[PDB]
Amino acid sequence: MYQIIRYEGGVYKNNILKEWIEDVGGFIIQEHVMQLDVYMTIAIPQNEIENFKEEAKKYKGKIVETPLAGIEIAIVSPSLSRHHLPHIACDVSEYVRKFGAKPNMIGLAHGAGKNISEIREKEKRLIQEHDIAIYVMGNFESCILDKTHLFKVDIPLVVTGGPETLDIPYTYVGNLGRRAQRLRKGEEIRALRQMIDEVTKKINDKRMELSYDPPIIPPVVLKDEIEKRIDEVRGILAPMPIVTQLDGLRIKMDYDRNHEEIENVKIGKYLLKDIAYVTRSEMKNYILIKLKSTSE
């Protein structure tokens, strides 16, 4: 119902556009002003899409269709060292961000090596808390083939590596190995686009399974209601104070101090504890909300 897009325009008369979005019932998920231009990730009803396009072209704005601006992605690098972090991993994260998704760098404690690589249970669960996980592996076929135990999570998976084709029992995108330069060549861009297409296909499939039994309330409007009710959300210093997942939300506030307040929030006529699974997150002791379906 609420298609999420990105608006790129200027800060001049942007408040009037925000007023129009509020009037038509949309929500401003993200706002950032660089110097004189403002980027807004907005979720508006589908019946007002053409109206918002007309309104945007009145302010000389730009509408960019973001197919991933409702999910958060766990990008799993073997380590945060100079080998993977400052290049390739940031390129993957930023390319994911370019399509609206909210990434999180997951640097494994013991993810490096061939036979000495291992993944902890806490890291496993932290990865599972996301919607989809992208693995940035090396550039040797034998090393990757002898590293399959790393990709053991019941989450949609896309594995990236050096060799063009791999024989792992997962989705694989080649020609994205461990490098040391910024990804700017045509082949590297094509491989990034291929990875984006694979994650988009997996996300659309998961969206269809979710649409088989829709949740009682959409995550975006639930986030809006939480912001309207909870008055501590504007004091959050995290990058994204409330993350919009596929079938829930991630509230970046202390669980021990604020779970009772979060649960006792009345949306429509239900209490939040009876329609969502509020639980502590492995992510810095934050609050994770998983929405129930209409079946229960």
Partner: protein, 194 residues
């Protein structure tokens, strides 16, 4: 050896063939130990001198956050006869994001008179010990000459609540920092952190 998870920024980078970071953005490293402050997301600061220090600290086992200042270029408005070219400043949200870390590492340029006043304005709202990484040879004391708290050379009338805890010279903007500078920074962070 422990897992290190970084809260990536919520906004994308500078175009297609440009930088990966964005001005006025913050990337939390969960456990807040060190925050690396970059004046701008441009090639003069990002990934050549800043992400190298970031991965050096992350290799040392210390979680790192990287904050790109909204207005990090220029000199503060409180500089003698005002500022010129551009105005340097620190936002209250930026100050709060910095102040939840145990230590701060900030990268400065080459002109001393710019660096001293930029550090004074930065420490007017930052209350944690910071390390100044610059190119020019600057002395611990010229900061105290304008009223900046300094570990070795205190001022009589301190105009800042933050302590310049170490000054490291020889790091050039836009150029790969050698392993020796990274080792010096890591040793200073370790011996003024725990």
């Amino acid at each position: 050896r422990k897992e290190q998870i970084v809260d990536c920024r919520a906004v994308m980078g500078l175009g297609e063939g440009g930088g990966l970071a964005q001005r006025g953005t913050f990337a939390e490293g969960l456990r807040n130990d060190v925050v690396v402050v970059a004046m701008s997301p441009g090639r003069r600061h990002i990934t050549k001198p800043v992400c190298e220090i970031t991965y050096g600290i992350r290799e040392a086992g210390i979680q790192t956050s990287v904050l790109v200042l909204d207005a990090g270029g220029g000199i503060p408005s409180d500089a003698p006869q005002g500022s010129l070219g551009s105005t340097f400043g620190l936002k209250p949200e930026e100050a709060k994001q910095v102040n939840r870390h145990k230590l701060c590492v900030i990268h400065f340029g080459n002109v001393k008179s710019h660096i001293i006043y930029k550090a004074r304005l930065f420490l007017k709202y930052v209350d944690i010990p910071t390390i100044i990484v610059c190119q020019t040879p600057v002395d611990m004391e010229d900061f105290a000459a304008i009223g900046i708290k300094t570990k070795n050379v205190m001022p009589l009338e301190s105009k800042t609540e933050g302590k310049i805890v170490e000054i490291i010279t020889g790091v050039i903007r836009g150029e790969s920092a050698p392993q020796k500078k990274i080792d010096e920074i890591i040793e200073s962070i370790k011996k003024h952190l725990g």
